[PDB]
Amino acid sequence: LLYPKLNQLSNSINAAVAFLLEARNLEGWWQDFNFPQAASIGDEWVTAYVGTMLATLPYAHVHEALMQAWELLKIRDHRPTGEWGYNYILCGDADTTGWALQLAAAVGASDSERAQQARAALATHLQPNGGIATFAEESIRAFIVSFQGWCGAHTCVSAAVAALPEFRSRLHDYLRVTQTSQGNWEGYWWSDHEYTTALTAEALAAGGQAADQPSIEQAVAWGLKRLCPQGFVATSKHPNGSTFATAWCLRLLLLNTVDAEVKAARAAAIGWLLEQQRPNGSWVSSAYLRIPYPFDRNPNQFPHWRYYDEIEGDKRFEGSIIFDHNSIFTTATVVNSLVKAAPML
């Protein structure tokens, strides 16, 4: 063991945690993403996600931050379903609600009245094909042509909701049948398949069924292919490495602890993420969120994506990609992956 590398992991993690705690707003929310002159800035979703990411840390002051985040979420009690959403003005959605429930578990509130109500509301989003849909049609229409894209089963949201032990068995078959022939999964709202693939493989691993182990191993083999020798996942947008996709690939690669090639790939990914950290403790934003047209069931077959902030003159969100302009969503993802990977150095 190279103690300098463990010490740098500590230093890197601590600098990121300080960045994230300082980055909260007046009331204490983590905010990220922006739909300018429309839906504004995310808060409930971003806070649920970031709080869940930081739940791996064994620091009392981080646990206090998570307790405060849950108290903020409980005050967002304005929706009749008990759901959370992107921010106050959005309708509830299953993804945000699932992350808020993961956070509730970390702070001992899984059995709370609100968590029970929110879990019940998640059940409303279960589809006939065995997955979970992000939105109920009339909800997202009331906030805003077919909405069957936005209101269909989503593999990214199903993978994340399957982190909840109450839903893991009900979503299992849908998660198994959606694996591609290459071993990965593809998401709906995200460009980077590492997100859906890591979350799905982690849900299968947590269910403990031996029947699922071949699928997990195929996903790990896909992750090993995705990570180049220099320690990153290359994308079209970031051909010299995506911090977001690399952090999710690192989490995927923790699902095999015996293979020497997998171990070496993790070590390479850790080194590259350590080198990429900015002086303020953050990593470069790379959490690319896509807005398919409402009718589009198949965004991985939409070749037209443009980056919203790069479009000149007239623009719309449909068919565009946004990112986490504060770097909070990316940084939380990276620091979580480094905390989870460090003991398997």
> What is the experimental resolution, given in Å to one decimal place?
1.3
CA distance 345 to 335: 15
Closest to 35 in 3D by CA, of 318, 258, 286, 273: 318
Tally the domains of the chain. Answer: 1
CA 247 from centre of chain? 11
Pair of tokens at residue 254: 């923790």
Any residues with CB less than 8 A from the CB of 339 and at least 6 apart, and which?
13, 56, 57
Method: X-ray
* Block residue for tokens 């071949």: 214
Residue 316's domain is classified under what CATH number? 1.50.10.20
Could you tell me if 157 and 132 are in contact, meaning their C-beta atoms sit under 8 angstroms apart? yes
Could you tell me if 212 and 220 are in contact, meaning their C-beta atoms sit under 8 angstroms apart? no
CA distances from 130 to 79, 153, 275, 278 (A): 26, 8, 42, 42
Name the β-bridge partners of 40: 35
Name the β-bridge partners of 133: 153
CA distance 75 to 132: 26
> Quick one: 130 exposed, middle or buried, by C-beta within 10 A (0-12, 13-18, 19+)?
middle
In 183-333, at which residue ranges do the beta strands (DSSP E only) sit?
A: 289-291, 306-307, 320-322
Q: Indicate the DSSP class of residue 310.
A: G
Residue 301: which domain range? 3-344
Closest to 15 in 3D by CA, of 281, 272, 243: 281
Q: Indicate the DSSP class of residue 211.
A: G
CA distance 201 to 215: 8
Closest to 195 in 3D by CA, of 119, 289, 104: 289
Q: In the chain, what is the straight-line distance between the N-terminal and C-terminal CA atoms, in Å?
A: 7
